[PDB]
Amino acid sequence: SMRISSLTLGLVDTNTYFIENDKAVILIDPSGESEKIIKKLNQINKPLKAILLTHAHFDHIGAVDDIVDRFDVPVYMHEAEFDFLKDPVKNGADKLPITSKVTPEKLNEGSTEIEGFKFNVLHTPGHSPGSLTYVFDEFAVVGDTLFNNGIGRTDLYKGDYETLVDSIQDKIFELEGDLPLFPGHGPYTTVDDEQLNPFLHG
Ligand SMILES: [Zn+2]
Ligand SMILES: [Zn+2]
C-alpha cells in the first residue's frame, strides 16, 4: 500500500525518504541537492503533500526551502526544535554556504493522519530534543537515533546519552522485531538485529 524510496545526499550522506501511496507522496528530511529531489518528485507524478523532519540538524533540512518554494507544502516537526531552523549554532551548520525560513507545523507523539497518510509518531529525543520517529505499517523512519550497528552522537546541542538509550530501548525497541528501520545515515536495520548493539548501555 506504500512505497518508500530514498536518495543519499549532501555533505554527510543523509538519507532523504520518499513515501508514496496510490495517489500522493510525502518527503522526509530533504537534506540538500534539491534539484535531484525535485527530479525524483517529478518522476513519481503524484502530488507532494507534506514534508516531515525527523529533526532539524542542518544536514536534514538543507533542501527544505527549495522544495517549499517550488511546491508550497507544510513542514512538520517537533516544536522542541523550531528554533533549530534559523539558528546555525543549534542545528550544527556553524562549524561553506544552512537554514530554513519555513514556519513549521508541530507534531506530537501519537497516531497522525496527514493528507491521507496514516502513521504513528514517537518522540525519541537524546540525539536532539525534537527527534521524531515515524512509524508506518511496513517500515519506520528513525532519524539519527539507531543506526545499523551504531547510535546517534549525543554530544551536540541538548544531546544526552542516557536519554537516547532510553528512547531506543523503551520506544524503538517496542516496534515489530523485523520491521525495516530507515535511519538518517547508513543502511537499514531492525529491532531484532540491534538487540546486542554495543553502544547501548545502562
Ligand atoms: Zn543529527
Ligand atoms: Zn544527520
Residue numbers in the entry: 4 to 98, 104 to 105, 107 to 211
Manuscript excerpt for this entry:
To establish the structural basis for FrmB and GloB substrate specificity and enable future structure-guided prodrug therapeutic design, we solved the three-dimensional structures of both S. aureus FrmB and GloB. FrmB and GloB have distinct ester substrate specificities, which are supported by the structures of their active sites. Additionally, the finding that mutation in either frmB or gloB is sufficient to confer POM-HEX resistance suggests that the two enzymes may work in concert to bioconvert POM-HEX into HEX.
GloB is predicted to be a type II glyoxalase and a member of the large metallo-β-lactamase protein superfamily (INTERPRO IPR001279). SaGloB hydrolyzes S-lactoylglutathione with a specific activity comparable to previously characterized microbial type II glyoxalases, but SaFrmB lacks appreciable glyoxalase activity. SaGloB exhibits the classic αβ/βα-fold that defines the metallo-β-lactamases, including glyoxalase II. Also consistent with previously observed GloB structures, SaGloB shows clear electron density for two zinc ions coordinated by six histidines and two aspartates.
